[PDB]
Amino acid sequence: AVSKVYARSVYDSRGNPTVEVELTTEKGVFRSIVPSGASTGVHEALEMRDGDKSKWMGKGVLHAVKNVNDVIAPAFVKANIDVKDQKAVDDFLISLDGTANKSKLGANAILGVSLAASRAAAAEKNVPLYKHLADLSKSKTSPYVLPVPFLNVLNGGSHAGGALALQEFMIAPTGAKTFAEALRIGSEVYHNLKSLTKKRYGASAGNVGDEGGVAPNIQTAEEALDLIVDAIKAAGHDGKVKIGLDCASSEFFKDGKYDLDFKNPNSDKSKWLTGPQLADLYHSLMKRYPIVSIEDPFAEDDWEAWSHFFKTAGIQIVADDLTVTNPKRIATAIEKKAADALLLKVNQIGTLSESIKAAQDSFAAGWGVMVSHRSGETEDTFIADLVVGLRTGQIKTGAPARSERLAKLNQLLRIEEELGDNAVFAGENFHHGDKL
Amino acid sequence: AVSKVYARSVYDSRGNPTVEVELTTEKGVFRSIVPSGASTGVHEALEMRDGDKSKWMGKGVLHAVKNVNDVIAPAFVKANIDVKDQKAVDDFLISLDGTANKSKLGANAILGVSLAASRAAAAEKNVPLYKHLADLSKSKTSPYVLPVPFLNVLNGGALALQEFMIAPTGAKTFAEALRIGSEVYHNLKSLTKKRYGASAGNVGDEGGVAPNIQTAEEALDLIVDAIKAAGHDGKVKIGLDCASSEFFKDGKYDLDFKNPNSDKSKWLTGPQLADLYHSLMKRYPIVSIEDPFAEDDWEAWSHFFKTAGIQIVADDLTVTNPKRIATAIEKKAADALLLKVNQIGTLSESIKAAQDSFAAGWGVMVSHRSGETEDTFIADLVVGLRTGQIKTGAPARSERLAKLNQLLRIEEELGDNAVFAGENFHHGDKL
Ligand SMILES: O=C(O)[C@@H](CO)OP(=O)(O)O
Numbered sequence: 001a002v003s004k005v006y007a008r009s010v011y012d013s014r015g016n017p018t019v020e021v022e023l024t025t026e027k028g029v030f031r032s033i034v035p036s037g038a039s040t041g042v043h044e045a046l047e048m049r050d051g052d053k054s055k056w057m058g059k060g061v062l063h064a065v066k067n068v069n070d071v072i073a074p075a076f077v078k079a080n081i082d083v084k085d086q087k088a089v090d091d092f093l094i095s096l097d098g099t100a101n102k103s104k105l106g107a108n109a110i111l112g113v114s115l116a117a118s119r120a121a122a123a124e125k126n127v128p129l130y131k132h133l134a135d136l137s138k139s140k141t142s143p144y145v146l147p148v149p150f151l152n153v154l155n156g157g158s159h160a161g162g163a164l165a166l167q168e169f170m171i172a173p174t175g176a177k178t179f180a181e182a183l184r185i186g187s188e189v190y191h192n193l194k195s196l197t198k199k200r201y202g203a204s205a206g207n208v209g210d211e212g213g214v215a216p217n218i219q220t221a222e223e224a225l226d227l228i229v230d231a232i233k234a235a236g237h238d239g240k241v242k243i244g245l246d247c248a249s250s251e252f253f254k255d256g257k258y259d260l261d262f263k264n265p266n267s268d269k270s271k272w273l274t275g276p277q278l279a280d281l282y283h284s285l286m287k288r289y290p291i292v293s294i295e296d297p298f299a300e301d302d303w304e305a306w307s308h309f310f311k312t313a314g315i316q317i318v319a320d321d322l323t324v325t326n327p328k329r330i331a332t333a334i335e336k337k338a339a340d341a342l343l344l345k346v347n348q349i350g351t352l353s354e355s356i357k358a359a360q361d362s363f364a365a366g367w368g369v370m371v372s373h374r375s376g377e378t379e380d381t382f383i384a385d386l387v388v389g390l391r392t393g394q395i396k397t398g399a400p401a402r403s404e405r406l407a408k409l410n411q412l413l414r415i416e417e418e419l420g421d422n423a424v425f426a427g428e429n430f431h432h433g434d435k436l
Numbered sequence: 437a438v439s440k441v442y443a444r445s446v447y448d449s450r451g452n453p454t455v456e457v458e459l460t461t462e463k464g465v466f467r468s469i470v471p472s473g474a475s476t477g478v479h480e481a482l483e484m485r486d487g488d489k490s491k492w493m494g495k496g497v498l499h500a501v502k503n504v505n506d507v508i509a510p511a512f513v514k515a516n517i518d519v520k521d522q523k524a525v526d527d528f529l530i531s532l533d534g535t536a537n538k539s540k541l542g543a544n545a546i547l548g549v550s551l552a553a554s555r556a557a558a559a560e561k562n563v564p565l566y567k568h569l570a571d572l573s574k575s576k577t578s579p580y581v582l583p584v585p586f587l588n589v590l591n592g593g594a595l596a597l598q599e600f601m602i603a604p605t606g607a608k609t610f611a612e613a614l615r616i617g618s619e620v621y622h623n624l625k626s627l628t629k630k631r632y633g634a635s636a637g638n639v640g641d642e643g644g645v646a647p648n649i650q651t652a653e654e655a656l657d658l659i660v661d662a663i664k665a666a667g668h669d670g671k672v673k674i675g676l677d678c679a680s681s682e683f684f685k686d687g688k689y690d691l692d693f694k695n696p697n698s699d700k701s702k703w704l705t706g707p708q709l710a711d712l713y714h715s716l717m718k719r720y721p722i723v724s725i726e727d728p729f730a731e732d733d734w735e736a737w738s739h740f741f742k743t744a745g746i747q748i749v750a751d752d753l754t755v756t757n758p759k760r761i762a763t764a765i766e767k768k769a770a771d772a773l774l775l776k777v778n779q780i781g782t783l784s785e786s787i788k789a790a791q792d793s794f795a796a797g798w799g800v801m802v803s804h805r806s807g808e809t810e811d812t813f814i815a816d817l818v819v820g821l822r823t824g825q826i827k828t829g830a831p832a833r834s835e836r837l838a839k840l841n842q843l844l845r846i847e848e849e850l851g852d853n854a855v856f857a858g859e860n861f862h863h864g865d866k867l
């Protein structure tokens with residue numbers, strides 16, 4: 001039985017407040033923390049902020065916390081919904097809010113209760129979280145699938161000070177045999193990258209962006225990718241490490257065109273590209289570099305551009321801001337054949353149940369699912385268990401630097417150890433990890 | 437009963453491997469992770485690294501993990517140890533290694549076991565970790581004392597000093613101190629990007645900004661501006677870590693030591709460097725200065741100590757080692773210990789180090805390493821030891837926030853049986 005639900009303010013990896021929920025049962029105290037985006041899609045569920053300029057730069061979550069303690073908590077404890085019944089838990093929370101985008105209580109009030117419930121349920125059932133999440137999602141556990149980590153080792157766009165427009169340049173050690181091997185390889189590439197970056201661009205270029213990637217002040221993707229290819233070679237892992245992008249192109253979409261200098265106030269609008277221009281450009285990057293995944297190559301509502309590009313892309317295309325982990329918007333994307341992978345962010349939609357439905361809808365359409373952190377992360381490690389539970393075969397959760405990233409990657413080490421011979425590493429088959 | 441001791445490799449905040457230990461009892465599995473320094477004192481207990489250049493850039497901890505699994509673990513379980521008896525735990529571990537500097541098994545093999553035992557012990561007692569640690573250290577718990585966070589918001593080490601910390605001593609609670617710190621940090625980042633360019637706001641290992649700054653005066657002016665912009669002038673003070681061993685050469689101190697052609701004729705003596713510190717101290721609200729002189733430069737410490745009028749913290753001088761601390765007390769070199777558990781390698785020795793310090797009228801600042809993990813032990817430790825001061829990062833990167841958040845939780849849990857050390861941080865233990 002749930003005896004207590006309680007929310008507090010804690011700090012995320014950027015030093016901004018976010019919501020922590022504790023759910024108490026006879027099995028103990030279960031804690032979940034809400035992450036926070038920077039390049040947030042306009043269609044994400046409401047992140048409720050206080051907007052008091054005199055506290056926390058206006059980024060307080062006191063109102064969200066209050067909604068937990070004063071509205072959700074009394075009703076939820078009164079109800080004593082079976083924590084194992086995740087559907088009912090989230091039915092309760094969603095109906096309590098009663099709005100489309102969780103704008104009454106806030107998605108960052110609801111999500112912590114949603115997640116903490118699932119932790120309590122796993123403990124009641126005497127199983128690891130990932131196993132409960134497998135149960136919840138009706139996912140195969142024989143064997144489990146461990147994910148390829150997509151490691152954002154070079155940070156751009158809104159995550160790092162500098163010219164570089166494209167938000168993320170990820171390495172994916174698909175050629176590794178185990179998760180632990182993938183993570184060692186990833187770390188080695190990263191450290192070689194850091195050294196090369198500092199030599200090429202100066203020492204302070206070795207300081208890191210929000211997600212732990214190095215942050216050289218460079219203008220072009222080709223520069224970035226050269227760095228990374230050099231780093232892969234230097235670490236000795238040629239052929240075993242591939243590349244993924246997050247363009248986050250909504251962040252530089254304007255007037256129906258795309259500005260690859262968006263962080264420059266003096267941006268020359270005469271250099272702003274177009275839908276086809278951008279697609280053909282992507283094609284050429286894909287020709288010259290071992291890129292196996294591109295995310296948000298076009299803007300969050302630019303459906304026709306997505307559709308046209310997908311026709312001929314030939315690699316995994318990930319929807320992030322396009323779909324915002326929302327089954328409704330995923331349905332559209334599926335119909336239009338705009339993408340073939342979902343980026344899963346639980347706090348884009350605000351409950352576990354809806355997140356699981358998003359994943360299931362995606363898999364059913366022959367899509368992949370990459371489970372994802374936000375750029376504002378915490379010491380919470382839920383998504384490590386989530387990506388294994390959901391059997392997706394791919395996660396992105398940072399560079400191998402800053403422990404809001406390592407916390408997830410370390411937890412995946414632990415899960416792999418526990419699973420032993422009852423897991424396979426997705427490797428080259430990350431895209432259809434669920435079908436393994 | 438302890439039925440298993442186990443080690444694995446995990447990754448620290450810089451993406452280098454480190455040792456994680458789990459200890460299993462009837463209360464379950466208890467986990468501790470070992471941190472790792474970069475500016476490590478030559479007298480630190482041995483961090484055992486593999487040196488296989490073909491793996492992990494040579495920074496593997498396979499050997500240390502092996503020492504846990506293959507040497508410590510079987511002997512430990514066989515010894516039927518009471519985890520509540522931390523001295524017995526650590527006596528065992530220290531005897532098993534049998535070297536002064538823990539060079540046989542590695543400090544990073546031993547410490548994880550030491551820390552995990554204390555967690556197992558708290559669970560057996562059904563108390564929070566900080567309460568058990570208070571027990572172990574015979575600290576006063578009426579009230580508990582919550583620490584001032586010293587937040588490393590700006591880094592050097594052209595700028596020679598390594599850390600520039602802010603300390604919200606003027607806050608009324610820890611929760612208030614943390615908010616103020618976060619707002620100052622964010623104001624600092626905004627000014628830094630404005631004045632030094634966008635790239636300058638990208639963070640260093642401990643979450644601080646590191647713009648190209650020539651001199652300490654320039655750094656400190658920037659922090660004062662940030663504090664004022666945040667609206668907290670008068671409530672936020674400053675701490676330094678000079679890490680002066682890093683620019684100690686040929687008996688003098690090179691304040692431009694990143695310059696390959698630094699003018700040797702301008703390198704400072706002990707007295708001269710002291711003079712510079714003094715001018716800084718007079719002109720800025722600095723209330724703590726750490727490692728102002730090198731790790732065996734005793735006379736320079738002693739000289740400065742006679743006229744310095746603020747907390748002087750020993751880090752590389754003392755490396756959390758009761759034997760070195762005794763020397764420092766005798767020579768009147770400093771009046772505060774930086775406590776790093778992995779500098780000495782067991783909890784018991786760390787607690788003794790703290791008690792020796794306190795008994796000599798010293799303060800104690802519990803400290804992270806520059807390489808941290810999601811482990812939050814030092815949050816519970818600084819409360820357990822009642823020291824009233826911790827440094828564990830800027831309020832950025834969650835290997836830092838993890839500790840600071842845990843302190844939020846402890847403060848909330850203790851309610852009116854805790855006080856915030858505030859301006860009284862130096863003798864927090866005597867409050
Ligand atoms: O766009 C992204 O994919 C996410 C994760 O990297 O970033 P943010 O949380 O800032 O939206």
Ligand SMILES: [Cl-]
Nearest residue numbers: 797798863866
């Ligand atoms: Cl005293």
Ligand SMILES: [K+]
Nearest residue numbers: 531532533534
């Ligand atoms: K012995």
Ligand SMILES: [K+]
Nearest residue numbers: 741742743744
């Ligand atoms: K004095």
Ligand SMILES: [Mg+2]
Nearest residue numbers: 037039040041
């Ligand atoms: Mg985004």
Ligand SMILES: [Mg+2]
Nearest residue numbers: 246248295320
């Ligand atoms: Mg994205």
Ligand SMILES: [Mg+2]
Nearest residue numbers: 473475476477
């Ligand atoms: Mg040091």
Ligand SMILES: [Mg+2]
Nearest residue numbers: 677726727751
């Ligand atoms: Mg120091």
